[model samples]
Target: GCEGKQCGLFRSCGGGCRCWPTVTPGVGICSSS
Candidate 1:
């Protein structure tokens, strides 16, 4: 998972977060999928 910017938080809380590409560039969100 490449969670992009939010990856930092996901990395802090441990990996395994689903990163979905957003309309913006170099940005995404992490989910507990």
Candidate 2:
């Protein structure tokens, strides 16, 4: 499980279709952005 901050980090570093740093039930996923 992960939090918004962690996802932010993923968004900042990973970029596009690869920003999913963590995955949890019902949380869905980090879509392309």
Candidate 3:
């Protein structure tokens, strides 16, 4: 689907770098607990 830097960007950028901003801590907590 993604290519090169775009894939990496999506990982950190989240949601294809759209309106979302990758809820790091929230996701962490949600996944852990």
Cα-based lDDT for every prediction: 0.50, 0.39, 0.26
Query: What's the distance in Å from true for residue 26, model 3?
Result: 25
Instruction: Give lDDT tens digits, candidate 2, residues 1-33.
Output: 222333443342234443444465333345445
Ranking by TM-score: 1, 2, 3
Candidate 3 local Cα displacement, residue 17, angstroms? 19
Reference-based TM-score of each model: 0.45, 0.18, 0.13
Who wins the TM-score comparison? 1
Q: Provide the global lDDT of candidate 2 against the true structure.
A: 0.39
Error of 3 at 7 (Å): 4.6
TM-score of 3: 0.13
* Residues 2-33, model 3: lDDT tens digits: 22222223342333332322354332111111
Per-residue lDDT of 8 in model 2: 41
Candidate 1 lDDT tens digits, 1-33:
323335332332245776665665655566664
Clashing pairs in 3: none
The residue ranges of model 3 lying beyond 4 angstroms of the native Cα positions read 1-7, 12-33
Output the better candidate (2/3) by lDDT.
2
TM-score (C-alpha) between model 1 and the true structure: 0.45
Could you tell me which 10 consecutive residues in candidate 2 have the lowest summed lDDT? Answer: 1-10
What RMSD does each model have against the real structure? 5.7, 8.4, 10.1
